[PDB]
Amino acid sequence: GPGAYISLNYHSPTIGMHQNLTVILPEDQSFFNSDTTVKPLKTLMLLHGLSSDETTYMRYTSIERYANEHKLAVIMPNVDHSAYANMAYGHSYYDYILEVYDYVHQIFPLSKKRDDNFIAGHSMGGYGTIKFALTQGDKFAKAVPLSAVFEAQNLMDLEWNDFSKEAIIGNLSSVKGTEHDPYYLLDKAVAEDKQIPKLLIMCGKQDFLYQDNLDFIDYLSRINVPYQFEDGPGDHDYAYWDQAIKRAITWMVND
Amino acid sequence: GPGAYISLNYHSPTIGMHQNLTVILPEDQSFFNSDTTVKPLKTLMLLHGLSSDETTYMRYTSIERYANEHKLAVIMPNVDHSAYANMAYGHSYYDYILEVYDYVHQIFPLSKKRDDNFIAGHSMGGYGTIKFALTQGDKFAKAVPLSAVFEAQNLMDLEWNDFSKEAIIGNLSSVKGTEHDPYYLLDKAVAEDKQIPKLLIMCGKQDFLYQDNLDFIDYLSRINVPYQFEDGPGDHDYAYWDQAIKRAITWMVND
Amino acid sequence: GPGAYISLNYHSPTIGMHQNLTVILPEDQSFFNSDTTVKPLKTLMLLHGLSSDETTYMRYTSIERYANEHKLAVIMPNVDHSAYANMAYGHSYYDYILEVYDYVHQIFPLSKKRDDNFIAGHSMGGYGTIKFALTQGDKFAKAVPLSAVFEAQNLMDLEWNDFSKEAIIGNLSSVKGTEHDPYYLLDKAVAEDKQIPKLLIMCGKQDFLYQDNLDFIDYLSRINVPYQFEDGPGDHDYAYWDQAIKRAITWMVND
Amino acid sequence: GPGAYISLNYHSPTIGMHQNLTVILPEDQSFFNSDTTVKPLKTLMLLHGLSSDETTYMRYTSIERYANEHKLAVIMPNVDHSAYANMAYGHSYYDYILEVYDYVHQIFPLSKKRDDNFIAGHSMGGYGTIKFALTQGDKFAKAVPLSAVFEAQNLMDLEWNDFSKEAIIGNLSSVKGTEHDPYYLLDKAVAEDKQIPKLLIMCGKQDFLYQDNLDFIDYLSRINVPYQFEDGPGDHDYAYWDQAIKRAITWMVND
Numbered sequence A, B, C, D: 001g002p003g004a005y006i007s008l009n010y011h012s013p014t015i016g017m018h019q020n021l022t023v024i025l026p027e028d029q030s031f032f033n034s035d036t037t038v039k040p041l042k043t044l045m046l047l048h049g050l051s052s053d054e055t056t057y058m059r060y061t062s063i064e065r066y067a068n069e070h071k072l073a074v075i076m077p078n079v080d081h082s083a084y085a086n087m088a089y090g091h092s093y094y095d096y097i098l099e100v101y102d103y104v105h106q107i108f109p110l111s112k113k114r115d116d117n118f119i120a121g122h123s124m125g126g127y128g129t130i131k132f133a134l135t136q137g138d139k140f141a142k143a144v145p146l147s148a149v150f151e152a153q154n155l156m157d158l159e160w161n162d163f164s165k166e167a168i169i170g171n172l173s174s175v176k177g178t179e180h181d182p183y184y185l186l187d188k189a190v191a192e193d194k195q196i197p198k199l200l201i202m203c204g205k206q207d208f209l210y211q212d213n214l215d216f217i218d219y220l221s222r223i224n225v226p227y228q229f230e231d232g233p234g235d236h237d238y239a240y241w242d243q244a245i246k247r248a249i250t251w252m253v254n255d
């Protein structure tokens, strides 16, 4: 059965502007009967990579088809070039993800239980995914970084088209040991006894970020944090993220 | 204060196809606070005229600015050339409006109280408005036909671009005494002692439907059904419907 | 290779209403250099099946990614339940496709050469594809029906959700030998020595329309009209059409 | 009469990401006749204020209705909190407006003649308008700042929600005498004998920026640059910009 594709534009109090957001809302019989209470849906926060935006998962994948198969609501915000940080010179986009989460859970029929909420994303969005997994573990039961950047000191110094490192991190000499460093966040999560979401980490074998992914899961192993790592043929493109997100969605909802 | 402009497309079980719908959802503080019970908004079902669709109130008026000012949610469906009827040869568009009503009240924080729900529309949508007011009086406390057609035979017999009367009414030589006839609907509603929503009827003095509007309120007068009628300069265009929907929205939300 | 995803809503003189249309416009370097002449793009008219609309190819396939890879503009109109006919009781939707063709070729940088123009669609849209291929053979060098209905008496008698046979064909007892019949259109095209676009016909072997497809290509063979027929595992769904439109796009832009 | 409302999302080589853009394209009989030469439309570049985006003129005004009346195409980009600058730490948003201009004039039937091209915008967009007027005078015959900031040091030190002064201007303490200072851009344009577009400057008399506007036009008078200034009741809101843009469009298209 099909569902709703929703484009929302609202003025965000956190980032001080109108901003577009897309939502996939699978249909439920209770949505068409006024006398019943809506059945709240499992919900996936889905984070785009660098140069993508709120439309690009819809356009370059079949995610809505996959989400419909599994009665999974999907939230796709736009965070520009922010790497999901509260920027030194820019917008508070880390806070924005938390606002979007609260907003769509207030207005749409989405379950608020931790077991029903997941987060995922690719490249910059996998980096975002792991940051939220390690700082908001109470909000998500599972997190799926796809082709993620785990060594951030390779992302800040990437000279991508119109990308500004300083807008994110200011005049910081190095991200190592800071809240921009997934390894620091991971050590801090373990040290503070925070719940870590269940981890499915995916990366194509031909991706430049592959060795970076191997390094991170090696570290997870050495600090006895469980994870599932899935590799196979694939590069750093939406042809890969199309197939990976289909697999990730099956894994999220089936526990 | 601002709010959310929302474009939705879902596969409707009533009309058997994907269909676009737009929704204005003004901001409430509870929408951004996870620990607050969402406070349901007053809701207007707003019906386009012939040749218009779910986008044209946004485009040709400032309706979102007026609705935000009064924290009024606005639902703008698309019903094509159907005159809001379950068509003889076409779609079940009367049933569709009821589906849309139920659907948005389930998936959005919209009040289900009769006193909080209103309906309005212009030309063919004023005709639609009076039909739902006289057959669904339980669902709406107030109804605002703008530049409406009350004598339905004029709309059926109209020579308009690509418009099909038979699509709506099939073989019927006249609409009088049928569910397509607002005068019969009004007689039936008075005969069955149904609730009739409070009526604000508006039409510009230069509108070609102005005499048709005079005829209807004369009849309302004659059978002692209460209403308010507002005329003044104006023609059958969105310049007038912009000004009229602004007045109409203020009227709905204030008791 | 990225491109533009475009939603257009304009008032159609042919069907007498505002209507949504979507357009994929792959990027060309001449689009960003004002000193260069626009190089017009090859263009595909892509027709949805019954219950789909202008949004559902973007939503349920990765078509924009395939089209970008091959610099192919894609035009995706909405024709409701019309089976791409000028309906007996409804809209002039056959003429509408011709207006859309003219409109987008006037306002966008699209090649007007027959060799650069293709048409394709699935189910009801495969039926529409073969109808336009056999009546507008001068406008398209290639045509691709996917999982199409060739024996039109089956679409007409289908008891699909809210679908109206009479809206399309009126009180015709049978479509055989009329303009609604692809076999009549095919006999007529051959007898009048019209150009028949190169045909690539695709259908999954588990599709209940498979035999219908086998019957039509058998007839093509018996009257010496060339075609390419590709079958294989696949059912009547967007998982199949996603795969098939990717292969169809590659076939149409190469020679 | 009618026209097309267009939403475009393309990956911009200038700002290195997908970005949404809105276009109003009034209808012309040449757009529907494959046999006639497209007559290019007069074109307005319309710039939003701080916290608005590419949707908010459509939502909060009836601009499409006014543009249609005058066969004026309208281009409405999104530039976030950039103040139309190539940001010190952020995106190349000044260059982005030049890209948008070139792109839409390549892919749409828009006049490339200076006399047919205009620019306008409110608050931060009136600031943008005067910056482009004084630096790209060959692109625009007419410019209309609405409720503009002309003394930029106040927009920079405004502590609007989530707004970053340093993102735009870097470590700079003052904007005076830089590319961010309309008075310096004005002095330069005069000293270099550049074409200055015809200026229509509008501001409500209850606006915070009224005095700032009086200061600017006083300086224009003292350096023999012509302008028309229109004030009258009005504050700093879309109620004013709706009425003002309606009059601005009339003034633009009439010679």
Ligand SMILES: *C(=O)N1CCCC[C@@H]1c1ccccc1
Residues within 6 Å of the ligand: A049, A050, A122, A123, A124, A125, A149, A154, A155, A156, A158, A236
């Ligand atoms: C992540 O979003 N990545 C997108 C494009 C490919 C590489 C880029 C990245 C590379 C190296 C380090 C960090 C990010």
Ligand SMILES: *C(=O)N1CCCC[C@@H]1c1ccccc1
Residues within 6 Å of the ligand: B049, B050, B051, B122, B123, B124, B125, B149, B154, B155, B156, B158, B160, B209, B236
């Ligand atoms: C209203 O929506 N109708 C469509 C075209 C313009 C007014 C028209 C109408 C006129 C007279 C009688 C019935 C309908």
Ligand SMILES: *C(=O)N1CCCC[C@@H]1c1ccccc1
Residues within 6 Å of the ligand: C049, C050, C122, C123, C124, C125, C149, C154, C155, C156, C158, C160, C209, C236
């Ligand atoms: C195609 O668009 N048609 C709509 C629903 C599924 C296939 C269906 C069709 C089936 C059989 C005969 C004709 C049409």
Ligand SMILES: *C(=O)N1CCCC[C@@H]1c1ccccc1
Residues within 6 Å of the ligand: D049, D050, D051, D122, D123, D124, D125, D149, D154, D155, D156, D158, D160, D208, D209, D236
């Ligand atoms: C204009 O776009 N600016 C954004 C917020 C409100 C008005 C504001 C501004 C006011 C005064 C001086 C500079 C900027």
